[PDB]
TrEMBL record:
The lineage of its organism: Bacteria, Pseudomonadati, Pseudomonadota, Gammaproteobacteria, Pseudomonadales. Residues 170-613 form the TonB-dependent receptor-like beta-barrel domain. It comes from Pseudomonas aeruginosa (strain ATCC 15692 / DSM 22644 / CIP 104116 / JCM 14847 / LMG 12228 / 1C / PRS 101 / PAO1). Residues 25-116 form the TonB-dependent receptor plug domain. It is a multi-pass membrane protein. Cu(2+) 1 binds at residues 78, 82, 258, 260. Keywords: Cell outer membrane, Membrane, Metal-binding, TonB box, Transmembrane, Transmembrane beta strand, Transport. The gene is oprC. Cu(+) binds at residues 78, 82, 258. PANTHER family: OUTER MEMBRANE PROTEIN C, TONB-DEPENDENT OUTER MEMBRANE RECEPTOR. This is Copper transport outer membrane porin OprC.
Amino acid sequence: LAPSVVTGVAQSSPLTIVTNPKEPRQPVPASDGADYLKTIPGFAVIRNGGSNGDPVLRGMFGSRLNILTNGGMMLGAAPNRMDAPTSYISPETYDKLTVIKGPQTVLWGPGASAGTILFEREPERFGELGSRVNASLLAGSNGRFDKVLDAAAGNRLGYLRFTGNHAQSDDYEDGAGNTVPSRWKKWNGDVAVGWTPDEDTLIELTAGKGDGEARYAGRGMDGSQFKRESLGLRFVKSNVSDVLEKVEAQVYYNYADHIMDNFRLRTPDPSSMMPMPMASQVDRRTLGGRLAATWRWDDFKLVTGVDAMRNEHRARGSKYDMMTDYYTDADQFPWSKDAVFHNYGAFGELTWFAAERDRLIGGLRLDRASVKDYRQTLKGHAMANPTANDTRADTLPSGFVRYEHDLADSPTTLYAGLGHAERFPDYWELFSPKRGPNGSVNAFDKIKPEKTTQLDFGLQYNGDKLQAWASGYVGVVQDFILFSYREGMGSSTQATNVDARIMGGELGASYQLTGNWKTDASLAYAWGKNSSDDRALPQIPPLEARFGLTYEEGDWSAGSLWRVVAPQNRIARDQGNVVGKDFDKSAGFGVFSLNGAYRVTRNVKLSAGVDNLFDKDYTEHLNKAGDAGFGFSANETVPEPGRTFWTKVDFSF
Ligand SMILES: [Ag+]
Ligand SMILES: [Ag+]
Ligand SMILES: [Ag+]
């Protein structure tokens, strides 16, 4: 019952990881969504700067991960994901983070081939009229400073709840002593109003907003604005009848308003194809809802429902009077809508509790997706858009079966699962490519959906001294949406569909040596082949191992962590996604860290860490190339941080 610092999260039930994001984490997260996934084996991150990394799950990028917040979808607006969904999330302000690996759920929306990720806030439970507050402060190297506050008050009938944060850091340094362009700032504030007439009923209104900025070593431009607007309403009714156990309904609204320039957090590079000041503003408006019923009886549990989502993207840019010095900022022109998406779905999951050591789970969903290209003109001056105002649509079924078995002698679950997932192309796959497949007018017009078929299998072992887990996967992907970079100038990109094979897995254990000594370890491995061109997939994270050792004693704990990464020699030069491309094989490396925690009272607890103690100078295979306007040469990727120190206090009254 001593506190400690999180260095890895184990897989708790089959395919499933649940963690409390308010816990300290030993490579200290930069207050964004991707960094809180680093602690879960299977996840890697593309670094852009000091924050707003792009999460990669089992080597799978982008919307193949379905990342929800309170059930709703946040989508950003940069043409090259400079503002990925996770850049708007602050995990500390949530209560639960859940990951389901593989296409093994249909409850949370379309296209979740790689996995679904669920940041949740839980409704307040208030008996007598009262209040609660929990908060934290973090301080560290390079001006790192974080405030987080979560307060609520209410009684049996209802509650008001506020959660907020402010967080920042200056440019960090790499192990070689170089200052990396990488400073950032984020703030959020969210209210929830809860009404609970009887305990069978809950109705919750939520609203919030946030803003931020980020310097990006790995881009020619910086994020001067990350405006978020959020509205949500949720209704849960339990115990409707003897078989109807729950009914939940949900509506959300997320607006994202991103600015992107080369003069507010940097100087315009005179040597680049962009010597003059230049901003570009983009927005994303997402509206969606969910309606689900949960039926329970005998040895069965059936969950049925529908969902729908719409979203809209606009952009507008600055102009530079090149024969004067006059600059007209982007907000002096009207927005140009360029894309609208629609999806509607119906879904069900059935569970059979055969016997008591036996579970069978099946799910199915049918999705109707559609998109309309609203670009009247394109990009090199302006030119005609050959698909102006065209629509296209498709109907996509997905589902899975999964069998779980509990052994009698020893506490072990074995599971295997077959799943099939179909994903409509997202905004970036249809609008961002400069070119589509060969002989197409553009990407919007031809890029096919992506269809994944995958076998998932693994085990859970829950002893008293030894907890172990493992999940492996083999799958094929039809019409994998691939980017190829055809620099030669600037860099032009082409979207194509290819066939792919994928395999890999994660495994981990945590063994209690004595009352005071705990040890754990994990390993994550992804692998991919372009079957169409007979060559590796690009942008695949290399093999990864974590080794932790912890000593607990009464009210305090001290731990050490080794992270060890193989080189990546399977690469696909000038291929990748909307954000990055492979170019060179990566070096293996090792990073070491230390941490401690101390509980000073039932209300106050302390934490501290040294990240990368030996000031190792390294980079990750997935990080972006650093920009020529900063110090970087060709394909030199962004380095990770050198030694950083952090300390943190947690309050809970
Ligand atoms: Ag951008
Ligand atoms: Ag620019
Ligand atoms: Ag320009």
